Design a protein around this ligand. Structure first.
Ligand SMILES: *[C@@H]1O[C@H](CO)[C@@H](O[C@@H]2O[C@H](CO)[C@@H](O[C@@H]3O[C@H](CO[C@H]4O[C@H](CO)[C@@H](O)[C@H](O)[C@@H]4O)[C@@H](O)[C@H](O[C@H]4O[C@H](CO)[C@@H](O)[C@H](O)[C@@H]4O)[C@@H]3O)[C@H](O)[C@H]2NC(C)=O)[C@H](O)[C@H]1NC(C)=O
Ligand SMILES: *[C@@H]1O[C@H](CO)[C@@H](O[C@@H]2O[C@H](CO)[C@@H](O[C@@H]3O[C@H](CO[C@H]4O[C@H](CO)[C@@H](O)[C@H](O)[C@@H]4O)[C@@H](O)[C@H](O[C@H]4O[C@H](CO)[C@@H](O)[C@H](O)[C@@H]4O)[C@@H]3O)[C@H](O)[C@H]2NC(C)=O)[C@H](O)[C@H]1NC(C)=O
Ligand code: NA
Ligand code: NA
Ligand code: NA
Lengths: 674, 667
């Protein structure tokens, strides 16, 4: 519930930014943004931009025309990408906030909804003056991607009937009036959307924050954008790539573990993919593409793409087999520091992997092609109209099990390369004159909580209604969550030093009930937190609350609540400092009444600062150390018995109901955690 | 513990019986059985057998030649089977104990030991003079088939070495000498191999009791032999078949649930089968065959087998397409629940399917060939020479996921028939003026405990060592599942003095997604725990039933040496004398979880036929002719079904202590 103060100039500018997220699916002919848009003469505005070549480029594509309103926009299709990147460059190179805003009002009014939102979200995140301003949560901007079609439909019907037929009847269908607004209860999906064991974890993969999280990841550093803005970070880009996915997959594999699901399965482009998924969405023209269980990847429609994909991976194998090779106009050694970066950019086909300021249409991307084949859609009708899968959007990608299958496949390939890195030696890890004597944690408890957000942006309003910037329509759904807990660390030091304290969470046992060995477990640990303590000689005890963990955040406030906070000169400080991290809700994987066993790994090493990175991301240790150190590479497990290391077995309990559905039953009062 | 008393005459006979289960692989030439065996002339004793035809057939077949002593007998192959059956006829039609005994002595001396034991074990069970007698648990008689080859080899090593060479070193391997037994700690197969998720269940599928259990089931009632002996039971044979599998499968499914493993996989004979089995067992000639994951059933070698199997099924599908048809000289109508008999006999292809006493080679078994193809072995060399798989033996069948997948398939087809039957109506099931007002159950808690079994029969001795009655005895110990005893307290309001039957079922609560389980489609996942009778007085009653008294389960077999001690005290074990073919008590509950895995208990009270007289258990079941598994022997309709004399209690299965069996086996 934490805030940050803000003056009137901010408030007024902020409000201007947010005003464009109102009733995104329509136009209020009475809005201020509409007057600005009408007043804006795009052909006479060359002087609004600091880059005339970008403006000229836009005006050219614009003279021929863009993606029409009402078609689905996706970053994964070439022409739409060029157009969206072009729009973004105008947003970005606008000289001023006033020029930025006029341009944004223009695009808001005259361009495809999805395109505009896409570029506007990114621009705000990216523009120097505009960063430090808050954005509505991805699910409040794009409800259509965060709301399964049962509810979305009920919403259509409720709006068409301007309320309920008879209030008791739609109490039974989970629809409520609460404070002049509607609330629809929403369950997670059937086996008619997840038609296999994967359904056990719908509550994770359909989770709105998880999905938001991935969308924020993309938006902070789009594959198509070079690193110029982040200077010295350019060097660490590929390294992020690995860390982001490795880390995400670890979090995901933990959920599997507590639902008895075991290892994410391998697959092949020459065989059928066992595990299907039926996205519960529809676009303007099309229901989303369904991928049934045992879907044949290898058919006529996909042959040429499979040829592409196969060689793409096999050339990585050739790079591993040589060790030094000239590739992409560089001479690159895989014992080199620069290697980690290369690898990452190679798999993502970055703008950085090439010359490029902005990615050339013609540089074929393994991720792009992978998502087309796994999405299982029919081939696009023309280049403005394609049949959407979940893999077509960062908002929806984490929903399809095939997503984790793809990125696990990538991560394994990079781990294959990671054999070329030099495993940390003993004195390397050994912190001289520093020992952790004990670690102690509070009770770790997961549980479920209803959570609300306003889905009004996917609901339609009348000419009259739009004047009021109407937003009646809320989705209440049980989401994972845990109680706050503290870790206390007992330390003995010879000397006063400065130390970094990192603590990770990972698995304890196989699916066979065997202890994981570190040589096989290191990729399965995810970072919870890091910080810097001045450490005194003698015995000390460091306490750390789950509330202060570096890698997690509070939920976003609805746009309504943001405005209510501006009215009293404030902003939600997590939405401010760190919108791009995992929600704290999802910090722990769902536990059991037993207590599910995991290891908390605590690690203390010497703090040796470097000049602050200017960061596209999660502020990471002001260190020359890698991301996710010391788990950034294969280990020699002997070297992990150091006195400044501590593995502590920890059990995650659960409380109240065991399944989200038990919360959305009309007339049943659930067991709520206390 | 639970015993029974026996005269010196029974004692002499019992010890004579057990002498054939003592050193099975070798012959003591000094021993009494050998002297008797070697020279005994069957021909001269022809008039000491009930059935001349049988004995003639035996002598014919025997002079032709039987299987050799070094090979591995299996009942699933024609020629070996027939030899066995003839030998069995010989044992069965013996005039008296003496002749039977003399007949065994001969066979032990002159024949393949596997064949002999198969034959003898069944004869002992099936002979009327021998009712009341006791056979040793199968894991003592055939220990090589109840342990993985790691352990077996350790046994042989220790024997070759005439003891432990470095006791401390041996202790690292779970081997130590304890008095005059050598003790081997034994881990389940997944401690050394986790090839697929099915390995999660090894403590069940390898449990020496479960496997022995199936072996008893077959021995009591072999597919090749008629149920003539059992009179009225014959008309119920099919019913017993379905019930046995449908129960076993339900119990299996429970284990699946608590390991997060869901419904039993379906296969196709025209397709590869996803679930492999890697048997860690062997024979003096060969290893058991392995079935890799995604093993293709449809290869040249199997083309004909598949045709046969496909047809066998399609044939039953056709029966289902008519409701009334003529097959195997009978007229069948699937609206008649008694047709279950025919249906069960059809699938098992048993003697009672035809009108016959024994099956014939030309009456080709669906189960035999299903087993054969699922077993994945290469084609047998000759009739006595094949590569064994776990489905060549009843001792080993439960070890292979494919076993459950096969019988699942069969059972399902049988319930496709059950759909023809009219659902029990409100007024078939009502118990007028009686009401179960409450059910309360004690703590339900599972755990593992070390269990030892005498595995000595696996050890070969010396000429010199045999006359010296030198001792090299071998025990194998491993954690086996068990549970704490518990009470079910049932509170019922009888309007009036009446005699009732109470029945107790255990069933799942949810499926693996948390969908609560509806009787309409989950009736066949109900596992029957108890069947008993009670006087019900007017007003309020309460029955207290303890899991020890549950009628459907048995105590662990006593070891031969312990039985041997009891005989010197005119004592014999009760459970082993009568109740051997039942499921062992310790396995009644699936492995719970530390926090309480959810199941449910279904109590059902219904009117008992007075008797006008006092009541005893075995005939009390036969006096009321309710079908096995009543009232859950056919599809239910939830709304038509529930009634005041029914009760459903949500229950929770906890587990205490060490959760993984290997932790017991740690050095
Ligand atoms: C039934 O299905 C048919 C076929 O799919 C649809 O017909 C299409 O209709 C769309 C309009 O919705 C047409 O696309 C638009 O029409 C014009 C095309 O002009 C043609 O001729 C000019 C020369 O005058 C050429 O330059 C050009 O190559 C075309 O062949 C354009 O005027 C439109 O431009 C407008 O919209 C764009 C964005 O789309 C803006 O950028 C512009 O400013 C401008 O406002 C647009 O291109 C399309 O041509 C039709 N297809 C075919 C094959 O004829 C029907 O719409 C559909 N019916 C229903 C009810 O859905
Ligand atoms: C999220 O998903 C969950 C899980 O699927 C849904 O929960 C189900 O919700 C429905 C309500 O929508 C439940 O259905 C109701 O069951 C009640 C309990 O009945 C018991 O007792 C009755 C006799 O009263 C027996 O017949 C029955 O077997 C049970 O023993 C009933 O009281 C309700 O009565 C209604 O019945 C008829 C329809 O046939 C109506 O016309 C009546 O007017 C009356 O409303 C009703 O049938 C069901 O139990 C829940 N399932 C589970 C597994 O718990 C949530 O609804 C869902 N939430 C959202 C927002 O989608
Ligand atoms: Na498409
Ligand atoms: Na997956
Ligand atoms: Na099956």
């Amino acid at each position: 519930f934490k805030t940050t103060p803000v003056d009137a100039a901010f408030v007024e500018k902020q409000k201007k930014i947010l005003s464009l997220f109102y009733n995104v699916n329509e136009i209020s002919y009475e809005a201020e943004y509409y007057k600005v848009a009408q007043d804006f003469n795009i052909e006479a505005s060359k002087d609004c931009y600091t880059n005339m070549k970008a403006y000229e480029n836009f005006m050219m594509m614009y003279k021929v025309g863009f993606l029409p309103k009402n078609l689905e926009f996706s970053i994964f299709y070439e022409k739409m990408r060029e157009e969206a990147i072009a729009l973004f460059k105008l947003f970005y190179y606008a000289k001023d906030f006033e020029c930025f805003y006029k341009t944004a009002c223009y695009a808001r009014v005259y361009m495809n909804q999805g395109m505009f939102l896409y570029a506007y979200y990114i621009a705000i995140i990216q523009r120097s003056d505009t960063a430090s301003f808050v954005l509505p949560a991805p699910y409040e901007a794009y409800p259509q991607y965060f709301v399964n079609m049962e509810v979305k439909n009920k919403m259509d019907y409720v709006k068409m009937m301007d309320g309920c037929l008879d209030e008791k009847i739609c109490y039974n269908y989970g629809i409520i009036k609460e404070n002049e607004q509607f609330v629809m209860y929403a369950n997670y999906s059937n086996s008619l959307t997840y038609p296999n064991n994967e359904d056990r974890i719908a509550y994770l993969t359909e989770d709105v924050g998880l999905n938001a999280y991935y969308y924020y990841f993309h938006s902070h550093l789009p594959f198509w954008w070079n690193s110029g803005k982040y200077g010295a970070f350019k060097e660490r880009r590929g390294e992020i790539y690995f860390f982001f996915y490795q880390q995400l997959l670890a979090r995901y594999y933990m959920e599997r573990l507590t639902n008895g699901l075991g290892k994410i399965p391998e697959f092949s482009w020459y065989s059928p993919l066992r595990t299907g998924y039926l996205p519960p969405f529809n676009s303007f023209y099309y229901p989303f593409a369904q991928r049934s269980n045992d879907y044949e990847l290898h058919t006529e429609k996909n042959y040429e793409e499979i040829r592409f994909l196969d060689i793409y991976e096999k050339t990585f194998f050739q790079y591993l087999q040589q060790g030094h090779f000239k590739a992409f106009d560089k001479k690159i050694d895989l014992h080199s520091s620069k290697a980690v970066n290369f690898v990452g950019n190679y798999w993502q086909t970055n703008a950085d992997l090439f010359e490029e300021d902005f990615l050339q249409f013609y540089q074929r991307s393994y991720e792009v092609n992978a998502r087309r084949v796994l999405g299982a859609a029919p081939k696009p009708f023309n280049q403005y109209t394609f049949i959407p899968s979940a893999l077509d959007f960062y908002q929806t990608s984490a929903r399809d099990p095939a997503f984790y299958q793809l990125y696990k496949r990538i991560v394994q390939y990079i781990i294959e390369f990671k054999q070329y890195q030099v495993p940390y030696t003993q004195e390397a890890l050994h912190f001289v004159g520093l020992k952790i004597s004990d670690v102690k944690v509070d009770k770790m408890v997961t549980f479920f909580d209803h959570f609300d957000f306003d889905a009004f942006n996917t609901v339609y309003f009348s000419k009259e209604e739009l004047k009021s910037s109407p937003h009646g329509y809320k989705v209440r759904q049980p989401r994972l969550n845990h109680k706050p807990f503290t870790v206390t660390i007992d330390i003995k030091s010879d000397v006063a030093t400065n130390a970094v304290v990192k603590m990770f969470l990972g698995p304890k046992y196989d699916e066979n009930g065997f202890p994981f060995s570190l040589e096989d477990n290191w990729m399965n640990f995810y970072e919870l937190d890091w910080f810097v303590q001045k450490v005194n000689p003698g015995q000390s005890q460091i306490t750390r609350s789950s509330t202060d963990f570096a890698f997690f955040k509070e939920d976003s406030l609805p746009m309504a609540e943001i405005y209510k906070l501006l009215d009293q000169g404030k902003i939600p400080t997590d939405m401010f400092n760190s919108s791009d991290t995992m929600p704290s809700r999802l910090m722990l994987p769902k536990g059991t009444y037993d207590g599910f066993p995991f290891q908390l790994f605590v690690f203390v090493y010497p703090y040796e600062p470097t000049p602050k990175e200017s960061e596209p991301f999660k502020a990471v240790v002001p260190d020359n150390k890698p991301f996710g150190y010391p788990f950034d590479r294969p280990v020699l497990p002997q070297y992990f018995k150091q006195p400044n290391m501590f593995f502590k077995k920890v059990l995650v309990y659960h409380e109240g109901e065991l399944f989200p559905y038990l919360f959305n039953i009309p007339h049943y009062t659930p067991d709520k955690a206390q | 513990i639970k015993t029974k008393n026996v005269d010196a005459v029974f004692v002499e006979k019992q010890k004579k019986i057990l002498s054939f289960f003592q050193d099975v692989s070798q012959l003591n030439t000094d021993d009494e059985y050998y002297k008797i065996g070697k020279d005994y002339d069957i021909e001269m004793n022809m008039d000491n057998y009930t059935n001349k035809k049988a004995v003639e057939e035996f002598l014919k077949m025997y002079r032709t030649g039987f299987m050799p002593k070094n090979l591995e007998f299996s009942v699933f192959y024609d020629k070996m089977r027939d030899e066995a059956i003839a030998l069995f006829h010989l044992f069965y039609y013996a005039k008296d104990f003496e002749t039977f005994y003399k007949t065994a002595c001969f066979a032990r001396v002159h024949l393949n030991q596997g064949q002999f034991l198969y034959a003898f074990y069944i004869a002992v069970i099936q002979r009327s003079d021998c009712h009341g007698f006791v056979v040793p648990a199968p894991y003592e008689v055939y220990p090589k088939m109840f342990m993985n080859m790691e352990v077996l080899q350790k046994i042989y090593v220790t024997k070759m070495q005439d003891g432990l060479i470095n006791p401390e070193a041996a202790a690292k391997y779970g081997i130590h000498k304890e008095n005059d037994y050598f003790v081997y700690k034994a881990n389940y197969s997944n401690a050394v191999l986790y090839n697929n998720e099915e390995q999660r269940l090894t403590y069940f599928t390898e449990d020496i009791g479960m496997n022995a259990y199936y072996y008893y089931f077959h021995s009591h009632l072999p597919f090749w032999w008629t149920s003539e002996k059992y009179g009225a039971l014959k008309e119920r044979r099919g019913e017993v078949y379905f019930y046995f599998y449908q129960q076993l499968l339900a119990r299996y499914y429970f284990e699946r649930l608590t390991n997060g493993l869901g419904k039993i996989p379906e296969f196709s004979w025209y397709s590869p089968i996803k679930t492999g089995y890697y048997p860690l067992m062997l024979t003096k000639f060969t290893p058991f065959a392995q079935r890799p994951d995604y093993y293709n059933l449809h290869t040249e070698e199997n083309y004909e087998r598949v045709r046969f199997l496909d047809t066998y099924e399609k044939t039953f599908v056709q029966f289902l397409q008519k409701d009334h048809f003529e097959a195997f000289g009978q007229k069948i109508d699937f609206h008649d629940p008694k047709a279950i008999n025919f249906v069960g006999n059809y699938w098992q292809d048993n003697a009672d399917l035809y009108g016959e006493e024994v099956t014939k080679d030309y009456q080709r078994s669906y189960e035999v060939f299903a087993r054969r193809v699922l077993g994945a072995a290469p084609m047998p060399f000759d009739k006595y020479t094949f590569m064994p798989s776990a489905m060549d033996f009843y001792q080993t069948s439960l070890r292979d996921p494919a076993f459950y997948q096969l019988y699942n398939r069969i059972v399902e087809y049988i319930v496709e028939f059950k759909q023809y039957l009219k659902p029990y109506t409100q007024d078939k099931l009502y118990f007028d003026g009686v009401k179960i007002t409450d059910v309360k159950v004690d703590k339900l808690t599972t755990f593992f405990e070390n269990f030892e079994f005498d595995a000595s029969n696996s050890v070969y001795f010396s000429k010199e060592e045999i006359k010296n009655n030198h001792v090299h005895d071998v025990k194998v110990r491993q954690p086996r599942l068990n549970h704490s005893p518990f009470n079910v307290n049932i509170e019922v309001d009888s309007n009036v003095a009446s005699d009732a039957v109470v029945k107790i079922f255990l069933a799942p609560k949810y499926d693996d997604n948390g969908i609560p389980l509806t009787l309409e489609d989950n009736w066949m996942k109900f596992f029957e725990l108890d069947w008993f009778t009670t006087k019900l007085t007017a007003g309020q009653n309460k029955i207290i039933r303890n899991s020890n008294e549950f009628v459907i389960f048995k105590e662990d077999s006593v070891p031969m040496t312990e039985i041997m001690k009891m005989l010197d005290e005119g004592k014999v074990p009760f459970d082993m004398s009568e109740e051997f073919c039942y499921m062992p008590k310790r396995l009644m509950l699936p492995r719970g979880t530390e926090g309480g895995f959810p199941f449910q208990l279904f109590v059902f009270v219904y009117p008992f036929d007075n008797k006008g007289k006092d009541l005893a258990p075995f005939e009390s079941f036969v006096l009321d002719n309710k079908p096995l598994g009543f009232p859950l022997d056919r599809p239910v309709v939830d709304a038509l079904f529930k009634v005041p004399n029914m009760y459903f209690k949500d229950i929770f299965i906890y587990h205490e202590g060490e959760r993984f069996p290997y932790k017991f086996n740690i050095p």
